[PDB]
Amino acid sequence: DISTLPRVKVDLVKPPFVHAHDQVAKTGPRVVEFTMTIEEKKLVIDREGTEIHAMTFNGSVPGPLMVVHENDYVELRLINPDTNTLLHNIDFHAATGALGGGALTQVNPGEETTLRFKATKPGVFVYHCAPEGMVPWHVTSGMNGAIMVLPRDGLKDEKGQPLTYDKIYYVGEQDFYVPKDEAGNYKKYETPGEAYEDAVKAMRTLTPTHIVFNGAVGALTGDHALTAAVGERVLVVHSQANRDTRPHLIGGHGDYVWATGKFRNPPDLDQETWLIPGGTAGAAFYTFRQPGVYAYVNHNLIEAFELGAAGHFKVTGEWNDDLMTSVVKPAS
Amino acid sequence: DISTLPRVKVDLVKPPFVHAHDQVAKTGPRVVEFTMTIEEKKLVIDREGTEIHAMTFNGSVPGPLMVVHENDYVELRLINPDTNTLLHNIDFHAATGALGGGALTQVNPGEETTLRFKATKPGVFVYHCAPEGMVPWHVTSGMNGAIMVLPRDGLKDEKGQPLTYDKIYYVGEQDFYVPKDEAGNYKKYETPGEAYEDAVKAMRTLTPTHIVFNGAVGALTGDHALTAAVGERVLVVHSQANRDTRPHLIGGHGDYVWATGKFRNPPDLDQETWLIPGGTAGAAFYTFRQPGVYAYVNHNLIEAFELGAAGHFKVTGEWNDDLMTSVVKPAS
Amino acid sequence: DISTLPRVKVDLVKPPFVHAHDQVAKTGPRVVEFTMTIEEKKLVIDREGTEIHAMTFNGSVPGPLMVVHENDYVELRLINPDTNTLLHNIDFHAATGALGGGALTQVNPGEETTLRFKATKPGVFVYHCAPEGMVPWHVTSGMNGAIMVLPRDGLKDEKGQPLTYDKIYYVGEQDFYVPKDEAGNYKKYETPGEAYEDAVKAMRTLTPTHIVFNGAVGALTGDHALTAAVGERVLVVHSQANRDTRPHLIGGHGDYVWATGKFRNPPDLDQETWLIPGGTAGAAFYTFRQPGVYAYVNHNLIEAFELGAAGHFKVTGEWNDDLMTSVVKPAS
Ligand SMILES: O=N[O-]
Ligand SMILES: O=N[O-]
Ligand SMILES: O=N[O-]
Ligand SMILES: O=N[O-]
Ligand SMILES: O=N[O-]
Ligand SMILES: O=N[O-]
Ligand SMILES: O=N[O-]
Ligand SMILES: O=N[O-]
Ligand SMILES: O=N[O-]
Ligand SMILES: O=N[O-]
Ligand SMILES: O=N[O-]
Ligand SMILES: O=N[O-]
Ligand SMILES: O=N[O-]
Ligand SMILES: O=N[O-]
Ligand SMILES: O=N[O-]
Ligand SMILES: O=N[O-]
Ligand SMILES: O=N[O-]
Ligand SMILES: O=N[O-]
Ligand SMILES: [Cu+2]
Ligand SMILES: [Cu+2]
Ligand SMILES: [Cu+2]
Numbered sequence: 003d004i005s006t007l008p009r010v011k012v013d014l015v016k017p018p019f020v021h022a023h024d025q026v027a028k029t030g031p032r033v034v035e036f037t038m039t040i041e042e043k044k045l046v047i048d049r050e051g052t053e054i055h056a057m058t059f060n061g062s063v064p065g066p067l068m069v070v071h072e073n074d075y076v077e078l079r080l081i082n083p084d085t086n087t088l089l090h091n092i093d094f095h096a097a098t099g100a101l102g103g104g105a106l107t108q109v110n111p112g113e114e115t116t117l118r119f120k121a122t123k124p125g126v127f128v129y130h131c132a133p134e135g136m137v138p139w140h141v142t143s144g145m146n147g148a149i150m151v152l153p154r155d156g157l158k159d160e161k162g163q164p165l166t167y168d169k170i171y172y173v174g175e176q177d178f179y180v181p182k183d184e185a186g187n188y189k190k191y192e193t194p195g196e197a198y199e200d201a202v203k204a205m206r207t208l209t210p211t212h213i214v215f216n217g218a219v220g221a222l223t224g225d226h227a228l229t230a231a232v233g234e235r236v237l238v239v240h241s242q243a244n245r246d247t248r249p250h251l252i253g254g255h256g257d258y259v260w261a262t263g264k265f266r267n268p269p270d271l272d273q274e275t276w277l278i279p280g281g282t283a284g285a286a287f288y289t290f291r292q293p294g295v296y297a298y299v300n301h302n303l304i305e306a307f308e309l310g311a312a313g314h315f316k317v318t319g320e321w322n323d324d325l326m327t328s329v330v331k332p333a334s
Numbered sequence: 335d336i337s338t339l340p341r342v343k344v345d346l347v348k349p350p351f352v353h354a355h356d357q358v359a360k361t362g363p364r365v366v367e368f369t370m371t372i373e374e375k376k377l378v379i380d381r382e383g384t385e386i387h388a389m390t391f392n393g394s395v396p397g398p399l400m401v402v403h404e405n406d407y408v409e410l411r412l413i414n415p416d417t418n419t420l421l422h423n424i425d426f427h428a429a430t431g432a433l434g435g436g437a438l439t440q441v442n443p444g445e446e447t448t449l450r451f452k453a454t455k456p457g458v459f460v461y462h463c464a465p466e467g468m469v470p471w472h473v474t475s476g477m478n479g480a481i482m483v484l485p486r487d488g489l490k491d492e493k494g495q496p497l498t499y500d501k502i503y504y505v506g507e508q509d510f511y512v513p514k515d516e517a518g519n520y521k522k523y524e525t526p527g528e529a530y531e532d533a534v535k536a537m538r539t540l541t542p543t544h545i546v547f548n549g550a551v552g553a554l555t556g557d558h559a560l561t562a563a564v565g566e567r568v569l570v571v572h573s574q575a576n577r578d579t580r581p582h583l584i585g586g587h588g589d590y591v592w593a594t595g596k597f598r599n600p601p602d603l604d605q606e607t608w609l610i611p612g613g614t615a616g617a618a619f620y621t622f623r624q625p626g627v628y629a630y631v632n633h634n635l636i637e638a639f640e641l642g643a644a645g646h647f648k649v650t651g652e653w654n655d656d657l658m659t660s661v662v663k664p665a666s
Numbered sequence: 667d668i669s670t671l672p673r674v675k676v677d678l679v680k681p682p683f684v685h686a687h688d689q690v691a692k693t694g695p696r697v698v699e700f701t702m703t704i705e706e707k708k709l710v711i712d713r714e715g716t717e718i719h720a721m722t723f724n725g726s727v728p729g730p731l732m733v734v735h736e737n738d739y740v741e742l743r744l745i746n747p748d749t750n751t752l753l754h755n756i757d758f759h760a761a762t763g764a765l766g767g768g769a770l771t772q773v774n775p776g777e778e779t780t781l782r783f784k785a786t787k788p789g790v791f792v793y794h795c796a797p798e799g800m801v802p803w804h805v806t807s808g809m810n811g812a813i814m815v816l817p818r819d820g821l822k823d824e825k826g827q828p829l830t831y832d833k834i835y836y837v838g839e840q841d842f843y844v845p846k847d848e849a850g851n852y853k854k855y856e857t858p859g860e861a862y863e864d865a866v867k868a869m870r871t872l873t874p875t876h877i878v879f880n881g882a883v884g885a886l887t888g889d890h891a892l893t894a895a896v897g898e899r900v901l902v903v904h905s906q907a908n909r910d911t912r913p914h915l916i917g918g919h920g921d922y923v924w925a926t927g928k929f930r931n932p933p934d935l936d937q938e939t940w941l942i943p944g945g946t947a948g949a950a951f952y953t954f955r956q957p958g959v960y961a962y963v964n965h966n967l968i969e970a971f972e973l974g975a976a977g978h979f980k981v982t983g984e985w986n987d988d989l990m991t992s993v994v995k996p997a998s
């Protein structure tokens with residue numbers, strides 16, 4: 003009887019940060035309430051000033067990470083304001099039935115809807131927009147995110163012992179297909195609808211023009227680098243709603259990795275690089291052992307360093323010479 | 335002594351259906367006899383009427399699924415009628431030696447051959463044509479299928495308890511590379527041999543023009559949608575002989591998945607999407623919990639919705655509001 | 667106290683062969699000393715005489731396989747002679763900190779450096795060059811290899827019983843992006859630096875022109891085919907520093923496979939084909955059961971047979987008719 007369950011309202015935060023939550027459930031099953039507003043907006047995606055008409059959940063690419071526990075109910079109020087121009091909906095890979103909620107959430111500009119589903123399977127899962135006839139266009143314009151459904155007793159290692167993270171980040175990786183004129187210059191459009199047939203043609207090449215973390219080349223660098231300290235346990239959730247990726251922490255490892263993101267399976271240990279298939283979210287747990295700058299990349303290094311799929315961690319603490327040292331510094 | 339073993343003759347059926355078989359072996363080891371006839375035929379692959387010269391086992395793309403048990407012998411009579419124009423053969427990834435049988439099965443038009451091999455490893459496996467010097471051309475013209483070698487005691491879950499399916503379907507996914515003229519229009523040819531050098535050039539782009547299930551855009555829709563009922567346990571075998579794919583059931587999950595298709599390994603649990611590498615068959619087990627239409631796709635959504643890699647399930651039964659419900663239907 | 671540990675100097679050998687080592691460690695932890703010299707050289711990569719300016723560790727593509735045990739220290743002397751023109755460095759995915767050693771190993775022509783790191787995680791791992799601003803160019807010009815860190819008690823199967831190999835080979839798979847003029851002819855350059863902007867443009871297509879094993883189309887064929895005997899246990903280490911691959915032994919299997927190469931995980935059993943993600947090394951163990959020629963390929967068969975990613979094994983011994991036999995040889 004759902005009306006007897008506690009309700010809790012969560013305010014979402016912008017990626018790569020994640021809203022507050024408990025790893026081990028401190029209550030019984032709850033109805034967890036979320037609100038997202040759809041925003042179509044112009045986004046500058048690279049250093050050259052290339053602009054696209056992005057389609058977003060809550061103003062960001064990716065959409066925010068939602069966190070619940072196994073056998074909670076998720077109740078999402080989805081708002082499509084009349085300042086938008088397109089029909090949108092939402093499909094949760096975490097959910098069972100009705101195209102993951104897609105069939106029940108079709109909202110025209112000026113409409114809203116509220117969907118409830120039971121989170122029956124633990125793991126990280128993609129969510130994305132999926133309107134009839136225009137699915138890849140919405141998804142590859144940025145309209146995707148992820149949801150984490152934790153086991154009620156938190157994460158476990160391959161021997162079933164508790165794994166507790168100190169920090170959690172969400173990296174959403176996005177393949178964009180910006181249309182090009184004859185010479186290879188990127189085209190510009192006044193509205194999302196103008197771009198449609200050119201977008202379809204660009205998509206059919208299967209060759210992205212940009213592949214980015216958190217919505218732009220360089221978004222997770224500088225003042226926006228991810229941070230940690232030596233000794234901290236970090237969980238990095240990574241999603242790709244459309245195309246395969248192969249994350250790698252340069253200078254580190256994935257100590258425990260759920261590459262296809264489903265926590266009832268034992269983690270893979272000591273990964274250098276792992277494959278997250280398009281349409282999947284994965285999670286990797288690492289304990290930092292050395293300070294300094296780390297690069298977190300898609301390890302197709304062209305996709306990383308030429309197309310944009312690279313971010314940074316900045317890690318503070320003590321250097322350990324037993325793990326690595328320069329014996330003879332570069333010299334003639 | 336093989337002559338003392340029972341022989342059983344199996345008549346194959348057209349994909350996505352599968353010939354009758356027992357999950358748990360009701361006899362000792364047998365010699366299982368199959369016959370396939372090679373057919374080169376014109377195939378219309380999309381809604382626009384694009385035609386290719388397909389190269390098929392038994393008239394279909396994919397070729398039919400063959401089902402045996404571990405330590406059966408498979409005896410295949412392979413016929414290449416004199417109405418064909420090309421040399422063909424067959425390579426079974428299930429088999430050991432002689433290029434998977436490829437070295438022993440080279441048949442010119444007007445010839446036949448009979449190969450026997452022992453099915454020593456349990457799993458789903460690709461089979462495909464592989465003639466010297468023209469391997470990818472035959473395979474990417476449709477000349478591939480799969481064989482399932484069941485354990486003698488049937489399938490097991492991650493804890494070694496029996497898993498029994500009520501229905502089984504075979505989805506063969508095919509990447510086609512249709513040659514294009516200068517402006518991007520698909521070319522037509524009178525015979526398979528005319529297309530050869532143009533086919534090689536189209537293949538070398540590594541960019542398929544079409545990616546389809548069961549031989550055509552829309553083949554597993556409408557009257558040809560896959561069917562099931564709420565509560566039924568369905569095994570979906572999926573093969574890709576040349577290129578990676580990432581299957582996803584829209585509105586469902588892979589409850590138990592052997593993504594690389596080999597049943598001595600424990601299944602992965604609760605998959606949203608899984609990667610089947612090119613040259614592999616995989617299998618996913620799901621119990622339907624909600625009625626309605628489901629889409630089964632390659633979750634590179636461009637490959638799905640623009641290039642053709644999407645089919646439907648139509649599921650009958652009772653709707654469960656505890657799993658999902660519309661709380662507030664789309665409204666102003 | 668590292669100064670009290672034994673030191674052992676290893677001389678590396680050319681791929682696909684591997685330097686001598688013990689599977690089960692016969693000593694306590696050691697400092698293992700290696701020397702590599704960087705060589706920029708012209709390489710002919712295909713039958714047509716296409717030449718590139720390759721960037722190599724120790725004169726080969728891939729660089730040599732280094733073999734140590736878990737909790738050894740690796741001390742690498744890296745030499746960049748003044749006959750080279752570029753700055754190089756080395757990143758070990760096996761190592762922890764400083765971009766895998768990349769931040770500490772930047773050597774101009776005429777310089778050398780010595781790096782030490784502790785091999786804390788068992789597995790096969792990529793190493794590659796990674797200079798600031800030119801990472802994918804160096805890697806896709808051939809500047810990558812692998813290192814194997816064995817458990818001190820050798821390899822184990824899925825039940826923890828010893829697995830011992832009789833022979834070990836290293837297959838390095840390389841994606842090249844040779845720039846093309848307007849008509850599609852490959853361009854030639856006097857020096858590595860001349861090619862830079864054309865190389866970047868060719869890389870951004872994400873479409874390799876060649877994909878090769880051991881540095882050239884046909885390199886592992888003929889007199890350079892890999893060899894084994896019926897009954898031998900062979901470990902094949904395979905690396906791809908930039909792009910996914912899907913190895914397959916034509917006529918065989920992967921009996922035990924670590925597709926992402928990390929030995930604390932149980933192996934996958936009975937694989938037909940497995941996916942090694944770009945930026946990863948994997949390892950597959952097979953016992954040969956039949957004599958003859960086998961082809962070892964990337965099972966995107968276009969990449970294999972058109973772009974170059976195919977090699978051969980030649981296996982001697984006795985034919986077993988119980989596993990496979992021609993019942994009726996091809997006839998009218
Ligand atoms: O700014 N609207 O796409
Ligand atoms: O946009 N309706 O709340
Ligand atoms: O789905 N493309 O990796
Ligand atoms: O092809 N996926 O990077
Ligand atoms: O080790 N980074 O490519
Ligand atoms: O899907 N389990 O990582
Ligand atoms: O119809 N023969 O390709
Ligand atoms: O085609 N010979 O039976
Ligand atoms: O092999 N291409 O996914
Ligand atoms: O690249 N395979 O979809
Ligand atoms: O959830 N289907 O893309
Ligand atoms: O290959 N086992 O899914
Ligand atoms: O031969 N030097 O690139
Ligand atoms: O190149 N210095 O030894
Ligand atoms: O990273 N390309 O398979
Ligand atoms: O896309 N990797 O072959
Ligand atoms: O079975 N070789 O493609
Ligand atoms: O990464 N273990 O194969
Ligand atoms: Cu949308
Ligand atoms: Cu989806
Ligand atoms: Cu054929």
Ligand SMILES: [Cu+2]
Nearest residue numbers: 425427462613
């Ligand atoms: Cu094959």
Ligand SMILES: [Cu+2]
Nearest residue numbers: 754795804809
């Ligand atoms: Cu270099």
Ligand SMILES: [Cu+2]
Nearest residue numbers: 757759794945
């Ligand atoms: Cu790397």
